[PDB]
Amino acid sequence: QNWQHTVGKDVVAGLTQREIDRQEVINELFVTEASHLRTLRVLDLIFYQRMKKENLMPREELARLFPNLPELIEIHNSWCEAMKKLREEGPIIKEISDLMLARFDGPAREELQQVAAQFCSYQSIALELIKTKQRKESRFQLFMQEAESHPQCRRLQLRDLIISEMQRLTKYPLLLESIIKHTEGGTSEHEKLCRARDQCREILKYVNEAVKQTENRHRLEGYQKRLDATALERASNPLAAEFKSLDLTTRKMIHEGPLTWRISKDKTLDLHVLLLEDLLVLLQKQDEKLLLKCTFSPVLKLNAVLIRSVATDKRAFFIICTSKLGPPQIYELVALTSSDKNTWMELLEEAVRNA
Amino acid sequence: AIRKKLVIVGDGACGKTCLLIVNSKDQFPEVYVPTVFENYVADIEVDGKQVELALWDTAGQEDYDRLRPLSYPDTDVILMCFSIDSPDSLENIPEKWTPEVKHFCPNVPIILVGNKKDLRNDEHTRRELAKMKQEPVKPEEGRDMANRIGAFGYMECSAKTKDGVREVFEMATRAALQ
Numbered sequence: 001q002n003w004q005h006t007v008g009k010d011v012v013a014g015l016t017q018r019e020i021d022r023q024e025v026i027n028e029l030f031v032t033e034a035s036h037l038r039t040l041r042v043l044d045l046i047f048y049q050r051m052k053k054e055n056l057m058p059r060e061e062l063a064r065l066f067p068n069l070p071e072l073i074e075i076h077n078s079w080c081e082a083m084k085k086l087r088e089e090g091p092i093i094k095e096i097s098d099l100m101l102a103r104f105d106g107p108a109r110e111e112l113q114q115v116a117a118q119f120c121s122y123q124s125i126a127l128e129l130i131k132t133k134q135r136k137e138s139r140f141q142l143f144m145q146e147a148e149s150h151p152q153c154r155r156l157q158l159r160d161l162i163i164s165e166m167q168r169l170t171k172y173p174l175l176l177e178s179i180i181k182h183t184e185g186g187t188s189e190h191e192k193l194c195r196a197r198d199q200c201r202e203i204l205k206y207v208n209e210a211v212k213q214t215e216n217r218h219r220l221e222g223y224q225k226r227l228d229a230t231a232l233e234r235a236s237n238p239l240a241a242e243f244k245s246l247d248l249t250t251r252k253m254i255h256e257g258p259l260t261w262r263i264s265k266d267k268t269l270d271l272h273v274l275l276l277e278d279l280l281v282l283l284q285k286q287d288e289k290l291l292l293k294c295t296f297s298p299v300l301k302l303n304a305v306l307i308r309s310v311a312t313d314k315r316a317f318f319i320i321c322t323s324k325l326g327p328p329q330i331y332e333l334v335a336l337t338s339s340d341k342n343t344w345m346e347l348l349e350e351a352v353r354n355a
Numbered sequence: 356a357i358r359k360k361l362v363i364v365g366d367g368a369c370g371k372t373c374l375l376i377v378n379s380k381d382q383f384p385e386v387y388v389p390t391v392f393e394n395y396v397a398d399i400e401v402d403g404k405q406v407e408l409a410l411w412d413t414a415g416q417e418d419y420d421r422l423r424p425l426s427y428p429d430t431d432v433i434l435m436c437f438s439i440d441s442p443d444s445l446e447n448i449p450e451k452w453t454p455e456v457k458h459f460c461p462n463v464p465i466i467l468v469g470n471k472k473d474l475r476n477d478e479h480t481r482r483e484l485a486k487m488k489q490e491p492v493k494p495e496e497g498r499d500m501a502n503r504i505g506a507f508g509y510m511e512c513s514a515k516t517k518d519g520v521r522e523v524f525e526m527a528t529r530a531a532l533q
Binding site: 002003004005021024025028032035120123124127154155156159160161163164166167170171173174175178201204205207208209211212215257336337339340342 | 356358386387389390391393394395396407409412414415416418419420421422424425426428429449450451454458
């Protein structure tokens with residue numbers, strides 16, 4: 001409910017509005033930390049431990065769904081116990097920045113980001129697998145509806161609950177920003193809370209990057225299997241022959257998405273294009289295959305192009321090859337919307353600067 | 356039970372969290388406005404149908420481009436917000452939030468909500484915008500945006516007064532059932 005109306009009922013009458021607001025935000029943080037711990041313990045008790053002991057799936061698939069749940073629990077449980085220890089010494093919480101730095105700064109940061117990234121990075125993949133399994137295996141579907149019918153799931157499904165770690169991590173900067181707001185400035189307390197908030201954003205940046213690379217890798221592995229580099233081993237021009245063995249797995253993806261290729265005299269091509277670190281790859285989607293085929297090269301080395309926005313067309317943009325060997329080739333590419341063109345431009349230009 | 360999933364998207368401090376709190380509670384947070392809204396199942400009735408509507412906040416996810424999509428799978432309806440007191444938030448609807456919602460939730464109904472409608476006629480608000488040659492978003496502007504993004508429907512509310520909050524979610528639930 002509320003800090004005011006429960007703890008510190010007799011002691012509220014003395015404080016300022018700012019010290020009340022400060023006490024409320026600290027209380028909400030404390031209370032939602034206990035509430036997160038309770039969710040993690042639902043995941044443990046209702047899902048993970050039963051899935052393990054009853055052998056609902058192979059240990060290897062289970063390890064990819066709950067890589068490190070016990071360590072995730074302890075990362076929050078110990079922080080929670082320290083919270084309880086502070087609450088004991090009086091209903092008005094004094095300085096709190098040390099408690100924050102003890103979770104979000106130095107070694108404590110390194111640990112938390114490591115553990116949160118391990119838990120989340122692969123999660124979207126693991127949930128697709130559990131969806132498939134639910135659909136193909138009746139004992140597993142039954143187990144899932146049995147488990148999800150438990151009152152502690154609060155009418156939510158595994159895939160609703162398992163995302164709470166990531167959601168909890170995004171709350172921390174908001175909670176801190178709100179504690180800072182009601183802290184008297186010029187204080188070390190304020191300066192250290194500001195540090196802790198800046199460190200949380202950094203942790204979130206780290207987890208963001210971890211999900212990103214794990215998803216991107218798995219995507220690229222799948223594209224490689226569908227990759228058809230037939231028409232390129234003999235080809236029509238040696239501007240294309242070196243990419244006969246492309247292997248998308250050795251590259252890092254920056255971006256991807258559908259583009260329309262204005263190639264000829266009112267003749268177009270709907271492509272699926274991958275912006276990699278070094279290359280822009282143009283592919284044709286047959287339906288379940290990715291075609292590397294040429295006339296124009298399907299692969300453009302980013303170090304040897306320029307990006308120009310089209311004057312009259314708010315959706316299109318040009319990619320111009322600057323290599324003296326590689327004839328008067330402008331690639332005209334059309335994005336979905338003007339916004340799509342924007343982000344396609346910004347990323348193409350950035351990648352080109354770094355190439 | 357008819358189970359449906361709602362995800363609210365939009366720029367930060369355009370009051371997403373606050374919108375969800377008043378709906379699920381039927382009351383505006385009097386003494387203290389919470390920062391935290393946990394994943395929550397609201398009971399809502401429309402056209403004679405009981406629906407368990409799962410409410411998902413994305414407050415805090417605005418800067419993390421690869422943490423956001425995690426909330427998107429299996430969504431039944433998207434509540435896209437802007438704030439009537441920030442024409443910035445509105446330009447961001449076509450520029451950031453609809454290409455993203457259309458990419459990760461193809462064919463999922465979208466309702467467009469202008470929050471803080473109680474700020475179309477705030478004098479303090481009006482001045483601030485007139486600085487940057489702006490003004491509170493007009494109903495027609497929100498409705499025109501709604502038509503351009505192919506939204507299911509356009510809605511306005513004020514979390515402060517509760518006005519329009521109930522109808523916002525009623526609309527979102529009908530969209531989920533479509």
